[PDB]
Amino acid sequence: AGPLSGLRVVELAGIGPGPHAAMILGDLGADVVRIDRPISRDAMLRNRRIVTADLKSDQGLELALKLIAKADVLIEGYRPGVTERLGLGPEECAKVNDRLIYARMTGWGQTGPRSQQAGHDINYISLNGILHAIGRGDERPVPPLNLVGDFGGGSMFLLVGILAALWERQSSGKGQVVDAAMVDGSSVLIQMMWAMRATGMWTDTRGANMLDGGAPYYDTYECADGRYVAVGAIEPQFYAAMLAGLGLDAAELPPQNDRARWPELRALLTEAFASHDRDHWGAVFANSDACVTPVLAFGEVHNEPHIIERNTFYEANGGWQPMPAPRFSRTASSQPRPPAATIDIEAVLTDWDG
Amino acid sequence: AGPLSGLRVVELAGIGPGPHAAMILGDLGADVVRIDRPISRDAMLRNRRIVTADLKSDQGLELALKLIAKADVLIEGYRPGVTERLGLGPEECAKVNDRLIYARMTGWGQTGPRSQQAGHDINYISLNGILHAIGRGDERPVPPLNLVGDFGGGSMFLLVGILAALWERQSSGKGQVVDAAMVDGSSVLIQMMWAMRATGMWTDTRGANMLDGGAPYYDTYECADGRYVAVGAIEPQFYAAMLAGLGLDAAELPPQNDRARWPELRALLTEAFASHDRDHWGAVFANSDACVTPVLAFGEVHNEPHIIERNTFYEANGGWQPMPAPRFSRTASSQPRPPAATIDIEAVLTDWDG
């Protein structure tokens, strides 16, 4: 259905960014075959075919190399050296398929003093300034779940890597190795802060910048029911619209960008938002340019009309899953196929004519 | 010198995800031409040629269509309808270039009850459950900068769309429109949590899950010097290594996953970490699998040897900026070319033959 219809992807079963990257390829129509160790309830494994092989046996390695020989992309998220030892390194795969985009998904990268060291998202964004920038200033840093290292600065960059190399392959006729490190990707994800730091527009003080919570017009507020709204009214005209819905006289308030009076401004805004329930503000702004929105819990998302009308989610059995993003006007993506039964690796090899 | 060498991109000057998406294309070797209104210190504007046009004028519109006519990709991030009213909408562009990938970068999407409504990253993640999940449980949610909406679920999905549509064009010989809504992209970015919620592995309770700060083995700790380490020792063997390095006896501790005793477990780890300075812990956990890393501020990143050795950053006039990601073994990217003076739109047309 989607734009990636026809792309053949071999995924070497891992955790975090690799399976997320392979999911998105599958979402957009790619033919994704996942090799695991010898039906899943993990919705992330939608849009797959699962085969199983012992990659350490002679037989297991033979079939995998036959399946790789007929594929465009290979995704692996093991420590550097692992596929090399298995006999599935890029130098080995090239001998059977020099068009393969060999996509290596790691946190620390392929080389360097930390390249062989265990880690998780929180570690990768700890070394590059990111984690230090997240949270309130009166407290130790909070992890932004694993959104920044694993996915935003991880699978997403593997994805751009894969498709960019597929583009390069059109003219070269050949593939290459993509080295996607969470530490690199997340750095480029946050290039805006690096840019701002050079010009005095961002500081290393946590919780005291325009976009981290420090600004009263870009932060959440608790309402009378103990739920929250999000205020994002950066531009003066949107800020104006926000004060107008709150019924605050701007002449009575400190200026929007007088940072010396920010705690005063926040105390006034906090008093206003505390005077009514979330769904009141919910309704007072619902339609304006005030950049004020309800802070919905996951369990409330499916009831939001904008979410509903655009089909951002679909029901799997037992809960909502996000539909494929982004959206394409001519070759639209299908509703994802749920995880299905592990199939015979020989069936795939015949299908792919390997 | 990257993989996207040869790719022609027109960027309509904007803010946030569009410009970040444009930068990454230029990073990977694309020929990006940014049309602005009638020399920048914004590092995000690297790898561009900048031209000027009044798109409200007859001459300016005409010039843009000549430029778009010779491009592969067009990036625009205005409210839906804005390009249509300028005479640069998808249907207008189709008439001069039906190979064009028309990439539309919004928060709320091209259609829907909120599609005409102003907003910013914090709004888009407020409506889909993401923001509610970020922060400590005792206090209101904290924005994870604009990493999640603008970039990870914003420009990154625009990029995936652009590149996937280009693969698609290989067989169809045609472009199409890419509708990248931040509200969609970020939901796919947090799909692991939608997976986990369905299987009893994630709760809507802020700050009480595996990866949100709720686990003592996945969080930051404050050290003797008032600086922090990140701990991410999820796996038992990594956890065991962590305890060893702290000098703690596992038989004297609650089990790693006895959530009932998590506050007990956290208190003991807190005491341990606070007994030495942050850099003591890096020394202690230098090469180990304890998943313990120093929480560095942006200003300190350039001193970290793993950062240094892998050339994750380059020095640009001003300060450090992230080098391109991900990395490619055969067609590697160049160090980004700095922002330069605005050039004559007509010289670009001569170059591109438009």
Ligand SMILES: CCCCCCCCCCCC[C@@H](C)C(=O)SCCNC(=O)CCNC(=O)[C@H](O)C(C)(C)COP(=O)(O)OP(=O)(O)OC[C@H]1O[C@@H](n2cnc3c(N)ncnc32)[C@H](O)[C@@H]1OP(=O)(O)O
């Ligand atoms: C320092 C802070 C102050 C700077 C501004 C704030 C941004 C800085 C903060 C950092 C990033 C912010 C972060 C949190 C974000 O979320 S960024 C993403 C924000 N959202 C989006 O981009 C979603 C799609 N965009 C939009 O909804 C809206 O463009 C915005 C962003 C809400 C802004 O609203 P707006 O200013 O009314 O813009 P639009 O409604 O698109 O109207 C644009 C008008 O300008 C005109 N225009 C543009 N270029 C030209 C040109 N070269 N020549 C002649 N005219 C030009 C267009 O024709 C259009 O006019 P019209 O259609 O109104 O008649």
